[model samples]
Target: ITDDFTLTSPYLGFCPYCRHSAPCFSPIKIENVWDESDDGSIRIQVSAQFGYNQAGTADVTKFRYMSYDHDHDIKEDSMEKIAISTSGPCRRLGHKGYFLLAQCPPGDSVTVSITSGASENSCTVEKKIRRKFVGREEYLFPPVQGKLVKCHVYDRLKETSAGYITMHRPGPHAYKSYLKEASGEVYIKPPSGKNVTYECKCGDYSTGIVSTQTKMNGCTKARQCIAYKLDQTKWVFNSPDLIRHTDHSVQGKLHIPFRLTPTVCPVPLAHTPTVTKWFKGITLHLTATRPTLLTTRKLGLRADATAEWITGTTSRNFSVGREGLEYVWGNHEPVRVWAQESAPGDPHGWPHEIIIHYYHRHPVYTVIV
Candidate 1:
């Protein structure tokens, strides 16, 4: 071996002079040019940005057009004798949106123009005959009211779609006041009648499902979410009729608490005493009248969380009956904390629980091995 030397390759990002020749290109390489001559006809390509950077174009109220020609004339004679055609009334394609295609029988003068609501004088463009053409055009639709508002039905017990509660209001209104579904929202005028009520009976309570286990009379599910009335003292503890009013608005607004107390067990212990104090101070009172024990494991318990009705998902809560309190070691087991009247004039009162485990008394720990 006689000598050893370092060799390097030149770093040329691109042909610098042609940088402006290219359209918007990211770092990656991809095919950009299209051959319109492959069809043996003069092609006039057009494109539009729809006023992405231009002011007063934010909401395009007018429609626009663009064309191309082979002759470089500023007058009408420069245009080629050919039929004009288009692909769309093209609604919203979003910001910087586009659609492109080549035109045939290249006109001598290419021109683009726009019009407001099928009228003349929008935006326009024109160009001399070229081998290829790329066009982009955008249009905007006017915003109109009477659009359906989305809503979710909840019962008096705060159940999503449970019990005999359902939505009630004007009878099957139209888009101006129509019912909306996943398929689409309706646009119709409200029917004229004070007694026109659109109501359905829901099961226990649910945000998504509807089926009843309680002996609530004439139970059904509403097709849409509505303000409902609740009647808690009867077999229908979450009666929709008792909660929803004749006006068709929701009985009460929904509120999501910023803080939520842990209602389930077998949870990892808190790392600090502060967390334990928090757990003890906050309580989630849960009561059940028709309790059913489903399964148990080293991880604790699993079953339908609610006994009132099946609301698709289960409540992750549990309690240790007085007999089960023996399982407690250093307050390790959930306790039967209280008994209360389940409802007004109700003979039965259910056992309720007040969980006390918090970070201070029961710090959370994890096992690595």
Candidate 2:
């Protein structure tokens, strides 16, 4: 499928011809032509080839080709009336290409001039008139659904009100107790000096009921008795005052127990058999008086014990009583007593355990003498 071609003119052949025939070398020719429509603008592609031998030439210089409005006398100042671009390799042969983009009014016929090479060679081409029309397309969006909301319920009284009820019966002497049932009108004093009254019903010494009134007192005082809601049950509103009376009481007894044991080593002894060496120990007796327990009372303790040494040497023993052991009735923390070896030379030979006794009581009485 080979097609043979012939050149009729001397200037229409390839490059680097004889000097005498240099004018005969005209190797530049258009290889391709096409048009593109992009966003109401026109783009023209012009592909041309130059006869210059790329393998033999060291010149890497670039050449610029241009397209512009043909009606502007091709002046540089008139280039603003049109837009064009040509960006491609233009120094070698075999299909060098470029693109030219131009702007013109729709439905208008525009003429453009394309120029290439140093000889200022150019060609004029008229573009086809472009048609104008309005185009539109329709679309639909997806539908959305609604969601359900959740709610919760709670008790207002349980969340906002708190207190313990205590009752006191008038007698020859008033002592705190949970043993009396008394019913009467209870008055609560508020911070504004206004007293609010409520009817209370109590029975069985410990059970009671409270009926609220339209006007209720809001107690805000610390260390003050707010009111007695029912018999043997007083409602103290303030936290600090509630804690103070919770640990308060009259005379009472608190019995606490303890123990003591001695560890002794045998040595050279007379009148003591070797078989009974371990049993040749001493016996001591101890006794202490239980003190009266109260928040305001001071108690004491004492003890007595005897010990005999098998070697006839002086025996060492420890006795601890109320000499330094005492505390207030409301002071419920544990009372501590520590014992060490009574003999200074024998660090490991002594009783390590001891005992003390006490009990707790809350005094109560009636109005009758």
Candidate 3:
């Protein structure tokens, strides 16, 4: 029969070897097919017999292989087989092979195309493959906390004044004290007493037991007492003095608000396994350890410092000499560490450890007696 006659048998039946019902109109007949063992590298091979009808000239000189992942319903162009051309006509095709992609999930399908003289004359075959196994791995780290500390002191002096009078006896018998004038001139008697009658004349001393002598030369001077007055009432303030006597050895406590960043471990170990047929995904668990000191000070003097991370209403008193000394709290839950492969837009991406921020106040009172 002629080549054209041999191509007309059109047998739409299942191939005992491929286990699929395929139309057999072209002279090319699939002979055998096989893929690399699950434990072996990725590779697939197909053998076919040219001019299977034993009368036509095969003319098949090229082949193309494409792969599709059924799980994601996406095409893997990188794993596609292209530019597969042969020399002259051959009854058997085997040297040409297709490579399976490493990223291709198990149980996906591959499409193979056999072409003759031109692209129009071609045959296609598809097959679903399976993986050897499936499994997963994980990584972990220890937990931790962070803190900040500070100290301060506040001091002030005050004075007061008032007005009074003093008295003096002249010769124990006659009082000769003069009236003391403060802001203006003053006299021993009232200014309206000029007409008052006096027991003693001008320049004459009062005689014997002059107890009722309320006037003297137009002025009153009976009692033996001296009076004093304030000129202008005023007050002064002293500059606030710095207390030089600081208790360097004084011990005080403080409770500060602190923040903690994500905790990190000193030694991180990754148990990533080799890419195998069973490889799936990985998980990471993070935790904190006991109190770890981040910083310390002799007399912390920081003012209103801020922290970011660990926060709450809880506060603990710490010694003043240990300012800036930070510590982390242990015994916490395991925070999940996410990866780009697992959690795409996670804010706290996969980190090996965490950080802590601490802030607080210390009041120092210095009383000078």
Candidate 4:
């Protein structure tokens, strides 16, 4: 009846009409209520309504609207009636419209009165509202391997991602060389979303032992079978450097050991022909390092010019020198040098300056005059 009423009743229940049902309702009372306005627009405040009664045995059975006062309602010539019904087992305190809120014209106020009908036990404090609906968006990136595969569903969002490669053979394709085959679209989506780069290096099983026959023991007989051996007849196998990145692109070299038989006899009677042996053991020492200074005619000038000298033939033998040691130019130097027989075929007129040491360190040069 008023604000401070210590009365308790059980007929307060929620509105079935607003909940899309019949007039089933609740037992309630107008304990406290108020209203306010901001920027000339009206707002309502409904406070706590306290009442207690068992649902099955309450003084009232149903509730019907009594009346309300509002300046805006009178000015608009509008009077509304709200209906209510009996309380049921589903009814509880605050189960019905415990507090009501409304938006009205500027400087407007509203008051509602409710009463229990003869056969019904419930009542409701009504409020008007304008609602707004909003939308939300969420984003995610699935861990597409090991525990979960690519096309697997994300249970929370009810969505799936692109397929993933869970387990793969251990190979170069497993991790390395994965991008070589990742070209083209994967699905209807644009190429930007395609994850084929990962699948390209997935399952690769192309690694195994490769072997061939060794023919080093029969190389001599194999070579004699043909006058000149074809390139295909010889085979060279090399174990290249496998320590670094394995994308090796070098042509390997052959490493064979020498094994020539003594039965392959050579002409042992060949002798060094000397036409005019000038000064035997006469070491013709030419100080110049340049081989041009060792020409046969140049040697003739150093010898008795009257001694007959071979016009174009020359032989070169070399040796390294020791510190403070006088070397017998014939062969007494401390280091071994290569012997090169040079006829130079008369055409190109022999290399006047033979390259003794192209580009080596502290190379000693000798000219046999």
Candidate 5:
């Protein structure tokens, strides 16, 4: 008998529904990148849920989100300061977390100065500054030649991502720089499924090998290749913290590794459906048009952002922060989460679209009853 009406904060802290009590700090957070504005004095939205240390609290908590730039990073000194009187003093908890502003890149080392503690109800729970960083186990492969194979990527949820990769064969879409380079393309949704599986296809008689992706930035490392060791029944392949940009002979990112084979065939790279989520500032637009509409009220969407009334437009829009995930909005199953790139762009102008980043820490949405 549960429906959207029953949806409430599953954990503690600021349950928008019930202006009630829950813990103050939480480990996981959904970054809400409000428009950047400067008023100085950085304050974290706090909760009366507990006072920490019961340890009598301080009215004005001091904090600052360290920006990563030249004067900050390379030209380091003490270019940062704290709040003399924070919005909600530590002594008296109220309000939730501050809507993060984008001054530099998204991952601001927002340091909230105050020993981790709770109030009389003193003992409060909180997450450590250490983020969820995972290293991957590098896999080796028997490299295959160009255009002989094809590859695709999927989240653990099994949703195939946007862009794809293929061994660069000079089609009518060939490039002058397409010399001795291996290539493919990719665009994936993340911060959700940290691990992804790589499916490379060759043929029944033949197998598969891999080549580092020439596009997509999710792939941390580059690999040689490997033949698809197809079994009698099915196919298998894999594994990642969006790592680094290092390609010796070849390889880029995103489309981490592409599959290769000794044979060739002509088939459409088109998926059952094509999806894309575009972000322009705080505006997030979805383009997964179908017959029916998507109602995500059950996923605990912020009260102010939940959509109700029916409209003929199936394409939906949401006020985006560092971006949010898409769901129920399905078929082959999946939508994506995207945010604007912080530093954004190389010497060249920005890419055609925004990048899907996972560098959010100031998560204020605490799951409460």
Candidate 6:
């Protein structure tokens, strides 16, 4: 445990201990090795809370790799044949956030290579011997200005990706000028852009689908979560936009809320209501004395309580206009109330009495009984 941040290290809520970990806070840099002139690209960094105790990563531990093109095609690599494994402790086995993120920071000793046109697959240089990369596919980052950042190929990883990185080019830009201006250096500046890719996570031993950005002219951001395992695929790059500005909930930035068909009803049938209020001062108040609760036994929640229909599997209506038998039997056969005109004029004259008598015309006991 440290001073500012505390690490509980308990049985269930312990901090993750990872090997070859490259941790950073949100708006952190994802990595750009390719020149932007090669393609029309927008720069993007992630904005998820990362590290041991950042915003979205405080409780994550489990991990998996998920990914693309012929992403299922098996290849001729030796280490690539290894099965997927989970890294970190996670709680649920359902859809969870599991992408952990990092980059070849300033001086990391991991070998970094570039893809070239020599053989169109010149990036194959890193595949030689001790290939730490798992799958034969590739993953990449956005372009800064005219330069695109390329990452090594590995559709799946024990630790997924998350967190956001802020982007600022070295050239004189506005975002950078502020830092330089306040400190004596002066120059015109360009806008410092933020791609804001966080992690896409799931529960322990769970899997999820990730969708790339689409439309919005400029929309960019990713996720980082912890899970057991996930599907991985081949990805080439991203676009010239940034994440929709910023929102802490951060979910609204996604082009498609989900890549895969949702497992449950993404939305529920619920409703909202208004309000009312008042007070008495000498006078009385009456809110209509209507028989709202049981006006003739009319129901408000009967459709679900009866076996006529189930909860999540059926649709129905209780309105009489929609049902043929909804009209009451007493209503269809009208029997007018007794009239008061039969009484005698004088008080002592006589009292009137009325009785219903009928002789049935049917051939059953109802005719004589």
The residue-level lDDT of candidate 6 at 100 comes to 25
Q: What tens-digit string does per-residue lDDT give for candidate 6 at 1-369?
A: 011212111011111111223331111122232112112111111211122322223343322111112122211112111111112111211112212212222221212111121111101011111112111111132213221223233212323332232222111111211111222222221122322222222232322222332122111221222111122211111213222222322111112111221121111111111112111101111121111111111223443222211212222333221111211111122111111222223334333211111111122543455
- Per-residue lDDT tens digits for candidate 5, residues 1-369, read 111111111111222221123433321222211211121112232222111111223112322221222111111112122111222322221211121111122232332222333211121223222211111111122124211223221121212222332111111111122212234533222122122222322222222222432233323222321212111111001101111223212121122111121233222111132344444322323332223334342222463435333323333455444545444332224445445545433434443322212212232332120
Against the true structure, candidate 5 reaches a TM-score of 0.15
Ranked candidates (lDDT, high to low): 5, 3, 2, 1, 4, 6
Pick the winner on TM-score between candidates 1 and 5.
5
lDDT of 4: 0.22
Give a tens-digit lDDT track for model 3, residues 1-369: 011322211111122222144443322223223433322122222222112222323223322211111111111111122212212221222222111112223333433334322322133344454443211111122213222112111000001111111111111111133232332222343122122111333345442212222323333333333322212111111101111122222122211111111222232222211221111222112222221211212224563432222222233332322232322222222222121222223335333211111111112221121
RMSD of each: 36.0, 53.8, 53.5, 49.4, 35.7, 27.5
lDDT of each: 0.23, 0.23, 0.23, 0.22, 0.24, 0.20
Q: Is candidate 3 or candidate 6 better by lDDT?
A: 3
Q: Lowest-lDDT window of 10 residues in candidate 2?
A: 2-11
Q: Write the per-residue lDDT of candidate 4 for residues 193-249, one digit (tens) a residue.
A: 222212111133221211221112112122111111011111111112112224333
What's the residue-level lDDT of 248 in candidate 1? 54
- On TM-score, the candidate that comes out on top is 3
TM-score of each: 0.14, 0.17, 0.18, 0.13, 0.15, 0.15
lDDT of 1 by residue, 199-306 (tens): 333543432212221122333332533422121111111122123324554332222111111222121111111111121121222222222122222222433233
Runs in model 1 deviating more than 4 A are 1-36, 40-96, 114-119, 122-126, 130-369
Could you tell me which 10 consecutive residues in candidate 1 have the lowest summed lDDT? 2-11
